[PDB]
Amino acid sequence: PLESQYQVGPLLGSSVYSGIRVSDNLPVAIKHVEKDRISDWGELPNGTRVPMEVVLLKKVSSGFSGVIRLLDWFERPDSFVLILERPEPVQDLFDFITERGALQEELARSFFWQVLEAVRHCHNCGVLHRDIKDENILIDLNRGELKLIDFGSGALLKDTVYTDFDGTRVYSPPEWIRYHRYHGRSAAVWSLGILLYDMVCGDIPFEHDEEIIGGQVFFRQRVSSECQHLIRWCLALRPSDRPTFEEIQNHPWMQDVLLPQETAEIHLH
């Protein structure tokens, strides 16, 4: 019972539909994925061959966190359908930055901190997202909580080298651009530096390969010296020179973060 358990509404993007669970009127998002277009396949704790996205979502689904929750899924002849919990009201972080421009550092701090906690949660669950970007972050405008979405480019986390990548190139690290190789955590930290710059400057720093490998970060907005330092550290050209997640969260710019509800009341309501 798939069409009987959810009322399907309008297209949110692409193929993802707004919907409501009939059992309790819970807002959901209904994501359809064509079998023919699936890159990596995995097996569930049952041996059922499913899209890796499903595997990764079940591994991070445990509990409450800043990660989108997979509520259910179904297999169809030519597709899989994914049922995700949908915040309401919501805006994704790309549209938010487009409308607001560069974010006040207090707000960027709260947002960036929540993305850090969410990505730590992924890594604790054995999952590498591989496509951190403002487009893949939802803001619950009433609760002030961020949610990481779209694990369609993710992978199981491992300590050895990755040689495949299907995320967003302008958030990919120079070792991928130059050598088509990267390690998971240090590549994640690079994308987080791109995201932090995006937040405090109003757009990402690099559009072209030469910029990505060039190692120069120009600040187009007024940005505090502490924040600039964190960004430049996350964007170190050598992966081993980048900070760990713990070093990011202990950085002086990251202290005295607002709680989510404070964030909503001060900046979103």
């Binding site: 487009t98 970007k133 369609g152 995320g167 302008v170």
Partner: peptide
């Protein structure tokens, strides 16, 4: 310059 989304 123009701000734009980037595909995966």
């Amino acid at each position: 310059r123009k701000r734009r989304r980037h595909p995966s």
